[PDB]
RNA sequence: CUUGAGUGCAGAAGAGGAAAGUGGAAUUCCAUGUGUAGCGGUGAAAUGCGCAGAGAUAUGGAGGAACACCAGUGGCGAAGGCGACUUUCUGGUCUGUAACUGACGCUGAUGUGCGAAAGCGUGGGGAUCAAACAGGAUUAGAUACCCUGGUAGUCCACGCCGUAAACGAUGAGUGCUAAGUGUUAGGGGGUUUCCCGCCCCUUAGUGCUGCAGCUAACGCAUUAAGCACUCCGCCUGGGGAGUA
């Protein structure tokens, strides 16, 4: 038993709509799984401090999530690889 | 000694932060260049310092900071 | 060293080998039994005989022979 | 496409312990035309003098201007004792560069390279 | 993990007196399940050291612990290595 | 009986481990576009690359690589070693704690795990790097080195590897003992707005100077190399020869 958080940048280029279904379809993935999710948070727009590919702006989400090492982490960093419309994450303990 | 730097500035925070919520303290906490300020002139206790350290080096891999800035 | 190692060893010492080779008769002429005679003196020949020399300044010249 | 004239490019500088290879480009950027200190007379122990950092300089930013150009910036890499010499007369020669950049990007940590010497 | 809450769980029947911290009985169960908890971890955690070093060290010591309740006691002892079913 | 040990509650604590994923600059290679004439290494260069574009450039990737700062007597560790980020599911860290069975402790022959690098078996990768290598300076000879490229392997899977400067050639634990005087986490008291600010007491380590002590000297000196204690191994001149 633990406490996991996460953060991940999810893109302008994409559509704000459609990615607010995919963030949401997360926090789903990732909740549904005994994950005591606590809050996901939309940064908005910002310019990137260093872009990737061609990111000169995008969103950021933040998660807390007080659960065990097999319900959240270890679900997602998967489904964040296949996660396309958004460059990268970040997953870590819940404590902020 | 020892050879740390500046502490008390935490008259509005402590004892653990931020990580992230506030980009202008990650401004002052290391150099600008990517590039460290070591703890040696930044002060916080090496388990403050290197909390602090991992989450401005997290925000270079979260994108939240640049890896290396440039100029 | 402790007390019970101490106990499970012998504290060995260093006991020398004797730089003189010095097997006399014992028991070379019956079986051809190697013992280890100190004889203070064998009787024996000089097979051979020599001379090497020696560097300088001391050119003491020494004469060697090998014997049995 | 041969030399892309612009009035402000960059003027890639490089020199070696034993060449001044040192080139104008473009911010877009491509190659237009450089020389090589080897190349300019300066050869062996020699390939890689002050003066010849100085002259491979000189016809690079020669042919700069004659590219159409008044303004340039410098990617000064090959770490050479002449090419700040070559750079100072680059600008007296005609040449507007204001932004001096001795550029050694090191990789992090980047594969071992060819490291005897 | 374990935390408090297994562990108060499995100490609530063999404490001679609810409020003791000897009498292993009820803390070499809890030893027996954090053993269980990070072997399923080394089966896991196929390769490492510390799993290694840290079961032996867990191990001996409730091992120990054991050895105690079959000198100190001699009941106690077998009616746990039955019930427990560890260190028999 | 309890503090040791236990474990008990509260916290504090992290390059610890191994698995997995994420990023990055970039060795090297290479795509495209531009662009010379040379690159090239030197004593000259040879070579080797290369005028059909080398060396160079800017746009683009590839692979594999270890991760720019921090980094420190930070830390983890028992060491090897352990630093890009993250997680895995665990191992360990301590403050306080005294929770209370009641010595449960002790180092530890054998045994025995873990473990730089290379090397290597196998099966892949190979990004470098790289012996050997050769082109090749040099010189009958030229690998000698100065070249150019490349090179087993380095790199991925497991074994073999188990070895080293793994060195502090300071086994461990115990507890005692001037100081000054820091650290790394703690705590407390008063001090004050958080005393965080101060101080001081110790917790447990890691400093520098130094009482005593002791060392041939060197210096340690509360973290002793001072004092003692259970438990391990070595050492026996040099070297012969870690070699047979």
């Given at each position: 038993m633990r406490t996991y958080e996460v953060m991940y940048?999810?893109?302008?280029?994409?559509?704000?709509?459609?990615?607010?279904?995919?963030?949401?379809?997360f926090n789903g993935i990732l909740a549904t799984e005994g994950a005591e999710v606590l809050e996901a948070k939309?940064?908005?727009?910002?310019?990137?401090?260093?872009?990737?590919?061609?990111?000169?702006?995008?969103?950021?989400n933040i998660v807390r999530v007080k659960s065990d090492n097999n319900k959240a982490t270890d679900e997602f960093q998967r489904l964040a690889?296949?996660?396309?419309?958004?460059?990268?994450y970040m997953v870590i303990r819940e404590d902020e | 000694?020892?050879?740390?730097?500046?502490?008390?500035?935490?008259?509005?925070?402590?004892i653990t932060h931020?990580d992230?919520?506030?980009?202008?303290?990650?401004?002052?906490?290391?150099?600008?260049?990517?590039?460290?300020?070591?703890?040696?002139?930044?002060?916080?206790?090496?388990k403050?310092?290197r909390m602090?350290?991992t989450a401005?080096?997290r925000?270079?891999?979260?994108?939240?900071?640049?890896?290396?800035?440039?100029? | 060293?402790?007390?019970?190692?101490?106990?499970?060893?012998?504290?060995?010492?260093?006991?020398?080998?004797?730089?003189?080779?010095?097997?006399?008769?014992?028991?070379?002429?019956?079986?051809?039994?190697?013992?280890?005679?100190?004889?203070?003196?064998?009787?024996?020949?000089?097979?051979?005989?020599?001379?090497?020399?020696?560097?300088?300044?001391?050119?003491?010249?020494?004469?060697?022979?090998?014997?049995? | 496409?041969?030399?892309?004239?612009?009035?402000?490019?960059?003027?890639?500088?490089?020199?070696?312990?034993?060449?001044?290879?040192?080139?104008?480009?473009?911010?877009?950027?491509?190659?237009?035309?450089?020389?090589?200190?080897?190349?300019?007379?300066?050869?062996?122990?020699?390939?890689?003098?002050?003066?010849?950092?100085?002259?491979?300089?000189?016809?690079?930013?020669?042919?700069?201007?004659?590219?159409?150009?008044?303004?340039?910036?410098?990617?000064?890499?090959?770490?050479?004792?002449?090419?700040?010499?070559?750079?100072?007369?680059?600008?007296?020669?005609?040449?507007?560069?204001?932004?001096?950049?001795?550029?050694?990007?090191?990789?992090?940590?980047?594969?071992?390279?060819?490291?005897?010497? | 993990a374990i935390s408090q809450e297994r562990k108060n769980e499995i100490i609530k029947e063999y404490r001679?007196?609810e409020?003791?911290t000897?009498?292993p009985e009820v803390q070499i169960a809890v030893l027996t399940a954090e053993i269980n908890a990070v072997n399923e971890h080394l089966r896991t955690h196929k390769k490492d050291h510390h799993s290694r070093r840290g079961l032996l060290k867990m191990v001996?010591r409730r091992?120990?612990?054991?050895?105690?309740?079959?000198?100190?006691?001699?009941?106690?002892?077998?009616?746990?290595?039955?019930?427990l079913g560890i260190?028999?």
């Amino acid at each position: 038993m633990r406490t996991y958080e996460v953060m991940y940048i999810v893109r302008p280029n994409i559509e704000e709509d459609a990615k607010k279904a995919l963030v949401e379809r997360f926090n789903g993935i990732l909740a549904t799984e005994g994950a005591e999710v606590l809050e996901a948070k939309d940064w908005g727009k910002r310019r990137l401090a260093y872009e990737i590919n061609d990111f000169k702006d995008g969103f950021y989400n933040i998660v807390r999530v007080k659960s065990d090492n097999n319900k959240a982490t270890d679900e997602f960093q998967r489904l964040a690889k296949i996660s396309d419309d958004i460059i990268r994450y970040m997953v870590i303990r819940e404590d902020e | 000694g020892r050879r740390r730097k500046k502490v008390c500035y935490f008259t509005a925070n402590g004892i653990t932060h931020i990580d992230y919520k506030d980009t202008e303290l990650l401004k002052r906490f290391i150099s600008e260049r990517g590039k460290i300020l070591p703890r040696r002139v930044t002060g916080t206790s090496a388990k403050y310092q290197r909390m602090l350290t991992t989450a401005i080096k997290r925000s270079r891999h979260m994108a939240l900071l640049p890896y290396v800035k440039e100029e | 060293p402790t007390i019970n190692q101490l106990v499970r060893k012998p504290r060995q010492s260093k006991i020398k080998k004797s730089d003189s080779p010095a097997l006399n008769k014992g028991f070379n002429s019956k079986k051809k039994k190697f013992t280890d005679l100190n004889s203070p003196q064998k009787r024996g020949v000089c097979t051979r005989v020599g001379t090497m020399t020696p560097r300088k300044p001391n050119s003491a010249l020494r004469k060697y022979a090998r014997v049995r | 496409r041969v030399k892309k004239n612009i009035e402000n490019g960059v003027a890639h500088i490089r020199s070696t312990f034993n060449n001044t290879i040192v080139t104008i480009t473009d911010e877009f950027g491509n190659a237009l035309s450089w020389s090589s200190a080897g190349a300019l007379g300066f050869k062996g122990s020699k390939k890689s003098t002050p003066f010849a950092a100085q002259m491979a300089s000189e016809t690079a930013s020669k042919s700069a201007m004659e590219h159409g150009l008044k303004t340039v910036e410098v990617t000064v890499k090959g770490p050479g004792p002449g090419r700040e010499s070559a750079i100072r007369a680059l600008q007296s020669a005609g040449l507007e560069v204001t932004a001096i950049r001795d550029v050694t990007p090191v990789p992090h940590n980047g594969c071992r390279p060819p490291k005897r010497r | 993990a374990i935390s408090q809450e297994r562990k108060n769980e499995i100490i609530k029947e063999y404490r001679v007196h609810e409020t003791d911290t000897g009498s292993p009985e009820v803390q070499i169960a809890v030893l027996t399940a954090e053993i269980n908890a990070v072997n399923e971890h080394l089966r896991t955690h196929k390769k490492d050291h510390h799993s290694r070093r840290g079961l032996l060290k867990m191990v001996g010591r409730r091992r120990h612990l054991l050895n105690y309740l079959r000198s100190k006691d001699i009941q106690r002892y077998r009616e746990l290595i039955k019930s427990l079913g560890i260190r028999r």
